[PDB]
Design a protein around this nucleic acid. Structure first.
Lengths: 141, 56, 55, 50, 36, 99
RNA sequence: AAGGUAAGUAU
């Protein structure tokens, strides 16, 4: 029920992302009252217990912190930016915008695999990393 | 009430603001932009008021 | 004295289509060879079962 | 029970006989015997023998 | 712990109820309605 | 660092040292101006007021009809939350934390 | 329209 930590102030999120060491800071931009964003928050809550050792999730509200809306072009719901090691990582998953996941993951295990791949890429030092599962298609059929 | 104006000042205005690539009509800012919101509407009029063959 | 005109049952065709949907479903990370071999097995099974009905 | 952090793999600092004994006990010795090589020419089996 | 303290959870729930008026407030005005 | 005040006088975007994620043009925005904006907003409101009343009335009627079929989530247990406060203070105090 | 920005490194 959206009990994850939330950035009341915009600058607080900035220093929270800055205060990172050997961990990935998943800043989930959006609004809790949105239904798709509610599903994304529920998925993040489910993941949080399993991967709290290196993956920290820290939500934020666009209305509360609108200064970062124009910084990374935050104009969609469910947006996720893996701002890790003080470096905005390039997560490529077969999408045009390979630096933003703006829709709730269908399954928790997929998100866990994605976040651990992001951690591996960040620790290796590369600023870009690909996804084992391409999302160019939704596998609707 | 308001009335019409001679076309000479309209011609002077469009000649002055011929191109926005310079520092001439840059002060307009929001005022200029405001009108842009209704740019397509005028096009409708220009496709409705366009002359018929008899209209020389 | 009599002729028997036969065709795949609607239930059988639906089951085969559901099998094809299942094969296409597990394509997130499965190997291409695995997928194509599953299709080969499915098509071979259907044909070997009722070639006349397929035709 | 949080999942372990996937740290980058670190090889053995020094291959020991006891470590070799574990390698002798557990490893891919039997799998290496079965060759996965496939001839370029067609095999005698059917297309979908499996 | 990873999760926020009880006061932060209560504040977040109050904000969600105040913003999303579909299931909270006196009347259901809109999803993003400031006042229900 | 949740629960900490934000030291003012510093721009969060510039102090952190970030790079503009220019995903695509024409997707982001990138006093006389205030008066013009107010005038244009007033004109837009005047244009929109042509159908506002009837549309609002119909929407209100439809919402009222929908509420009767199925009310809000908290409505199904309004009586329960009314009787929820009847629990003693020592009751929820000794709630077993274990699951 | 697109689903086709390698990252890294100091200037």
């Amino acid at each position: 029920s959206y009990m994850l930590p939330h950035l009341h102030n915009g600058w607080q999120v900035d220093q929270a992302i800055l205060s990172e060491e050997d961990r990935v800071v998943v800043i989930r931009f959006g609004h809790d009252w949105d239904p798709t964003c509610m599903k994304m928050d529920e998925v993040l809550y489910s993941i949080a217990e399993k991967v709290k050792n290196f993956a920290v999730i820290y939500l934020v509200d666009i209305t509360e912190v609108p200064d970062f809306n124009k910084m990374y072009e935050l104009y969609d719901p469910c947006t996720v930016m893996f701002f890790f090691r003080n470096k905005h990582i390039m997560i490529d998953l077969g999408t045009g915008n390979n630096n933003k996941i703006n829709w709730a993951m269908e399954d928790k295990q997929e998100m866990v695999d994605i976040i651990e791949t992001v951690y591996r890429g960040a620790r290796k030092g590369r600023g870009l990393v690909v996804s084992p599962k391409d999302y160019s298609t939704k596998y609707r059929y | 009430q308001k009335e019409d104006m001679p076309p000479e000042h309209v011609r002077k205005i469009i000649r002055d603001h011929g191109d926005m690539t310079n520092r001439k009509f840059r002060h307009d800012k929001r005022v200029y932009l405001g009108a842009l919101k209704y740019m397509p509407h005028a096009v409708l009029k220009l496709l409705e008021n366009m002359p018929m063959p008899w209209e020389q | 004295t009599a002729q028997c005109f036969l065709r795949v049952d609607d239930e059988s065709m639906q089951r085969f289509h559901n099998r094809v949907r299942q094969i296409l479903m597990a394509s997130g990370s499965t190997t291409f060879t695995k997928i194509v071999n599953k299709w080969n097995t499915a098509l071979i099974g259907l044909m070997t079962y009722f070639r006349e009905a397929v035709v | 029970k949080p999942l372990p952090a996937p740290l980058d793999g670190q090889r053995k600092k020094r291959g020991g006989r006891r470590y070799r004994k574990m390698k002798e006990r557990l490893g891919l010795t039997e799998i290496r015997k079965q060759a996965n090589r496939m001839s370029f020419g067609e095999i005698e089996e059917d297309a979908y023998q499996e | 712990e990873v999760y926020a303290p009880g006061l932060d959870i209560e504040s977040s729930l109050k904000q969600l109820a105040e913003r999303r008026t579909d299931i909270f407030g006196v009347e259901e005005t809109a999803i993003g309605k400031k006042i229900g | 660092f949740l629960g900490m005040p934000a030291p003012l006088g510093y721009v969060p975007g510039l102090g952190r040292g970030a790079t503009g994620f220019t995903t695509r043009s024409d997707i982001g925005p990138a006093k006389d101006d205030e008066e013009a904006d107010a005038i244009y907003a007033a004109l837009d409101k005047r244009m929109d007021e042509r159908r506002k009343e009837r549309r609002e009335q119909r929407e209100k009627e439809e919402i009222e009809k929908y509420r009767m079929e199925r009310p809000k989530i908290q409505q199904q247990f309004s009586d329960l939350k009314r009787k929820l406060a009847e629990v003693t203070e020592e009751e929820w105090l000794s709630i077993p934390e274990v699951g």
